[PDB]
Design a protein around this ligand. Sequence first.
Ligand SMILES: C[C@]1(C(=O)N2CCC[C@H](C(N)=O)C2)CCCCO1
Ligand SMILES: [Zn+2]
Length: 140
Amino acid sequence: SGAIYVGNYRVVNRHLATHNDWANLVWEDSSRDLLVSSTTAQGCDTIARCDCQTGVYYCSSRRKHYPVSFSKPSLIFVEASEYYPARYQSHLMLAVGHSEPGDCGGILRCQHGVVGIVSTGGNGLVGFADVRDLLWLDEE
Ligand SMILES: C[C@]1(C(=O)N2CCC[C@H](C(N)=O)C2)CCCCO1
Ligand SMILES: [Zn+2]
């Protein structure tokens, strides 16, 4: 589990969104595994606006932050899980690292701010849903 809290937005994995998230929906995209809902309180996270390919992510199943090198956001084939059939997920970045179902939501960050959240795992790989192209998170 985990979310990004920027401005009056909460960014979560679409497959982990709660009823309150769907009842206060701003935007969702199944192909990216992302959903954004509105919040009453302002958040403290800042979004990175860069092309970094190195950063650090939080792994809840290890209670640890790991430094990683990650690929550029791309369209990647992801195997079937309890939440999605086997399909292509867009705006996904891959790295070598540990990721279980429960690690989704952990933040990946670079020197500029939050880059994305854990969305996929297994086989010694971790995949992150990028948010750096969502410029509207910084306004309204
Ligand atoms: C099985 C695993 C996973 O990769 N997925 C399940 C949850 C949905 C994920 C997706 N397609 O965005 C895929 C391993 C890592 C954490 C989440 O569960
Ligand atoms: Zn950066």
